[PDB]
C-alpha cells in the first residue's frame, strides 16, 4: 500500500489546449472525500487515498493499488494556478489551469 | 525517437567559472532552427529536434538518437537568468549565466 | 499501445460475497461503446479500448495506457455465468456472477 512517505503514483496525461493547460490522472474508485488538491506558488500537488481491503475479507485476487496516491507538478510561471478548475468523472481527475502569458516575452538567440 | 512527452536527453557538463555559471550540452548535428532556449523565473529549458531519417532511406546503421531533445535546469536564486548568453559550436550548446550574489548572505551555523 | 494480439491488462480485485462472486477492474476513462463482455461456457473475457491520442496533438505528458485492454477469467463450474451482471461506474467495471453450488459436493479425504 502507498503511504504518505512512499505514495503510490498515478498515471498522468498533460497537454496545452490553446489558452489552457490540462492535466488528467487515472484515479478510479476514489472517494471524493479523499481527493485533495493543494496549490503552491507554482506547484500543484494531487493526493488521494483508496482504502485498504477489510483485513477480515479473503480476496481471491487483489491487484488494484491501494492506499495513498500522490503526484506533484512543478508548473511554469505563466500558469495562473489560483484559477485552477478540477473535476472528477469516470474515475479521471481533470485539472484545467489557465495560461497567462507575460507581456513581450524573452526569445533567446544563439550565436554561432 | 524522442518526443515532447518523452524527450531524448542530452549529456551536460556544468561548473562555476568565477562570476559566471556555465552549462554545456552535446547536441551534434542539430539545425539552429530547432534550438529553443526558454528561461523561466529560475528555470532554463533547452529543446532541440534532430529530424528522423527519410522513411524511404534504407540505413545500414542508424544508432544516432533522433527526434526531440530536452533538458530542464532548476537554477538558484543567485543566477541572473535574464542575462543568459548561448552559443552553438562544434555541436556543443554552451550557456553562460551571470552569477549575481545577494548582499550579506546567510551562513547557517550548526549546534552540537 | 495495447493491441488485440498484445493487449494491455487492467488490474483486478476478486472475492466471494456470500452467494455471489464479484470481480472489479480499474478501467478509467473508457467509452462504454468499447466495453465488451464475452461469456463462454465457464470463461469471462473483458475487452475495452481507450483511443490513442490525436497524432497531431503534442502531449507534454502521456503516461496513461491506451489501446486495447483485455483480461480473461477461467471460472469454476459452480458459477452461473449466464446470469452475469455488469456495471461501470467511477471508472470501475464490476461483474457479479451468482454462485450455484452443486448438490452434495465431493470432499476429498487424505490418507496418512
Amino acid at each position: 500500500l502507498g503511504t504518505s512517505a512512499r505514495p503510490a503514483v498515478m498515471p498522468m496525461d498533460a497537454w496545452r489546449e490553446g489558452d489552457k493547460f490540462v492535466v488528467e490522472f487515472d484515479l478510479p474508485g476514489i472517494d471524493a472525500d479523499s481527493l485533495d488538491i493543494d496549490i503552491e506558488r507554482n506547484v500543484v500537488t494531487v493526493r488521494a487515498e483508496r482504502p485498504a481491503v477489510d483485513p477480515n475479507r479473503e480476496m481471491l485476487a487483489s491487484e488494484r493499488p491501494r492506499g495513498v496516491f500522490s503526484r506533484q507538478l512543478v508548473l511554469g510561471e505563466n500558469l495562473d494556478t489560483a484559477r485552477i478548475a478540477a473535476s472528477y468523472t469516470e474515475g479521471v481527475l481533470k485539472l484545467q489551469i489557465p495560461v497567462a502569458e507575460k507581456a513581450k516575452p524573452r526569445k533567446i538567440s544563439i550565436t554561432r | 525517437l524522442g518526443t515532447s512527452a518523452r524527450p531524448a536527453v542530452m549529456p551536460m557538463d556544468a561548473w562555476r567559472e568565477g562570476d559566471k555559471f556555465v552549462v554545456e550540452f552535446d547536441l551534434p548535428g542539430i539545425d539552429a532552427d530547432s534550438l529553443d532556449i526558454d528561461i523561466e523565473r529560475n528555470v532554463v529549458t533547452v529543446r532541440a529536434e534532430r529530424p528522423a531519417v527519410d522513411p524511404n532511406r534504407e540505413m545500414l546503421a542508424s544508432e544516432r538518437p533522433r527526434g526531440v531533445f530536452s533538458r530542464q535546469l532548476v537554477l538558484g536564486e543567485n543566477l541572473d537568468t535574464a542575462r543568459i548568453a548561448a552559443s552553438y559550436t562544434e555541436g556543443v550548446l554552451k550557456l553562460q549565466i551571470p552569477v549575481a550574489e545577494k548582499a550579506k548572505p546567510r551562513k547557517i551555523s550548526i549546534t552540537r | 499501445l495495447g493491441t488485440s494480439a498484445r493487449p494491455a491488462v487492467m488490474p483486478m480485485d476478486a472475492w466471494r460475497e456470500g452467494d455471489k462472486f464479484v470481480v472489479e477492474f480499474d478501467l478509467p476513462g473508457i467509452d462504454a461503446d468499447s466495453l465488451d463482455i464475452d461469456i463462454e461456457r465457464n470463461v469471462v473475457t473483458v475487452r475495452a479500448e481507450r483511443p490513442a491520442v490525436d497524432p497531431n496533438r503534442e502531449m507534454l505528458a502521456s503516461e496513461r495506457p491506451r489501446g486495447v485492454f483485455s483480461r480473461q477469467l477461467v471460472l469454476g463450474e459452480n458459477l452461473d455465468t449466464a446470469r452475469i451482471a455488469a456495471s461501470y461506474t467511477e471508472g470501475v467495471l464490476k461483474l457479479q456472477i451468482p454462485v450455484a453450488e452443486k448438490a452434495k459436493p465431493r470432499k476429498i479425504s487424505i490418507t496418512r
Partner: peptide, 4 residues
C-alpha cells in the same frame, strides 16, 4: 503550458 509549462511544466517540469
Amino acid at each position: 503550458g509549462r511544466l517540469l
